[PDB]
Amino acid sequence: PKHEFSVDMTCGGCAEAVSRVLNKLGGVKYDIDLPNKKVCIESEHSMDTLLATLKKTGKTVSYLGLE
Amino acid sequence: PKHEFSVDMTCGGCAEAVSRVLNKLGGVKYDIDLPNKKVCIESEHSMDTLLATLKKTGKTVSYLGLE
């Protein structure tokens, strides 16, 4: 399952912080698109776990959809 | 007690994220100095708790000690 999220990243640092919390979670393959403020995650982790993980950054996150 | 932390924030978005995680924790009085990458926190929360809360952002965090 490839989950797509909007994440309000406004600099390179914001992008790297997203990658670090995702790394900490583990069991993920992801790509972070800074200019489009979009994070795509391939994972067996539920949408709720991914959402909660991303929201720990303190950034504004919303779910865009799936696959 | 009055604690000081270094937090590797590079833009205003990074400062907001720190603000959001500290607000979510509660029981804190803080000020964020973006250009100096420093966050001062007065709290009854342990150093451990404050450290862990800051490290949630996925930003690089270190401890600058008691004021």
What share of residues of chain A is helical?
25-40%
The 3D shape of chain A can be described as globular
Strand order of the largest sheet of chain A: 2-3-1-4
Helix/strand order of chain A, N-terminal first = EHEEHE
- The count of DSSP E runs of length 2 or more, i.e. the number of strands of chain A, is 4
Count of folded domains of chain A: 1
How far is it from the N-terminal to the C-terminal residue of chain A, by CA? Answer: 6 Å
PDB class: metal transport
Keywords: beta-alpha-beta-beta-alpha-beta, transport protein, cisplatin, platinum, Chaperone, Copper transport, Ion transport, Metal-binding, Transport, metal transport
Assembly: dimeric
Entry title: Crystal structure of cisplatin bound to a human copper chaperone (dimer)
Summary of the model, kept short:
Chain A is α+β, with helices and mostly antiparallel strands and 67 residues long. Chain A has a single domain, classed as Alpha-Beta Plaits (2-Layer Sandwich).
Please provide a written account of the structure.
With 67 residues, chain A is of the alpha+beta class. The first copy, chain A, has a single domain, classed as Alpha-Beta Plaits. Chain A has helices spanning 12-25, 47-55; strands at residues 2-7, 28-33, 38-43, 61-66. Chain A has a four-stranded antiparallel sheet with strand order 2-3-1-4, covered by helices on one side. Chain A is globular, with a radius of gyration of 10 Å. The A-B interface holds A 8-14, 16-21, 24, 56-59 and B 8-14, 16-21, 24, 56-59. Chains A, B: The modification Phosphoserine is found at residue 46. Chains A, B: Belongs to the ATX1 family. Chains A, B: Residues 1-62 form the HMA domain.
